[PDB]
Amino acid sequence: AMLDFERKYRVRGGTLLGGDLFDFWVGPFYVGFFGVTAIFCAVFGFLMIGLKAAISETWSIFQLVLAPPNLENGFALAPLDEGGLWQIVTACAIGAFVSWALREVEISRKLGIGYHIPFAFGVAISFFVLAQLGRPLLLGGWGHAFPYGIIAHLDWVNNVGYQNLHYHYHWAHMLGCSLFFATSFALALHGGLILSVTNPKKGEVVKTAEHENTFFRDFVGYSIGSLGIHRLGLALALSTSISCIFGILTTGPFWSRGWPEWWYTWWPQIPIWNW
Amino acid sequence: MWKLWKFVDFRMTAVGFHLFFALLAFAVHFACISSERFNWLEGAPAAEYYMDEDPGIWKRTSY
Amino acid sequence: MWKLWKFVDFRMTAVGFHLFFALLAFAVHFACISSERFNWLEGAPAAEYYMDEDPGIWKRTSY
């Protein structure tokens, strides 16, 4: 139940908050106080999701949604049957994500590694927070935040995108879709490169960093290298999450017309070609 | 300022000034273009063509 | 304040001041362009051209 080398690192300390009381492992998982709070928020939020499934009679992961209150509700606490369950689960999700990231900070301290992983997770959490708080603050109510349904939040994404007519044309959407595609492209390239170096044809020896460098130099003229590929990957995925922040915070709050009309508003009128 | 190059790199200062002045010349020329009075590319008449007297700049003219 | 350069990088200070003053010169020129009274490129008249008296700045004028 423990890795061949795991016990060698399973030491006390590294906790941000929890001391030695929560500083232990249950099976593979390190717990920590932030693990305790993450489990609390996760299980309570899932129990509120089940409560909405019960009250809405929607026992389908796909059809069940915790939607935020109505727009007329504003920032007020809603009835649990009118968006209050969504508010509870929003608090639970923020708490669980923050607790998970802080538990990862604890694990990083215990392993002596940098806090890059909880930082990247915190970038994703920052998207969630700015989407579920920043968009309500910009637009004046919890009802502008996306709901909690496996399929229904896709419907919210659909409707919020089509509120600006053609959401593809959103500048933040264009940049962020390019960034997601570049992230999957670079993950494919990087996994393929590492596996190609370490899994050549049968009978061939494992190649080196020189091999992979000259592979991408021969291939596309540039090789970003071992450190560069991971730096670029963290950058690409993070930047796509920041692009998601900008997209969710600008569609509506900072452009209520169509994003096609947004593009028409400035690009065709750029004076170097508007004549 | 002849001692400024003891502390401030002249290559940096000169390159930055030349780039800034290139794009600032672009900006100022475009500001003239955006002005109807100063757009030589469109060549609109000056108001002084239709003025009976010298408008002045600091001259305290009255209607 | 000649001793400030014992504790604050002069190159950093001067470079940042030139950067911020280029930015602020642009911002102030755009503020003048935004103002109808001060947009020299559009060349709007001054309300003083139509006033019968000096408006003043601190002058306690009454309608």
């Binding site: - | 940096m12 200062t13 | 470079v15 642009f26 935004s34």
Partner: peptide, 29 residues
């Protein structure tokens, strides 16, 4: 000034600031 004209002027100003600052930002360590 027209909003497109002033916006393009601001764009050229921001580009000028970036171009002037680029040798600064390159040597900023």
């Amino acid at each position: 000034m027209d909003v497109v004209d002033i916006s393009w002027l601001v764009t050229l100003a921001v580009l000028a600031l970036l171009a002037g600052a680029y040798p600064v930002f390159k040597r900023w360590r």
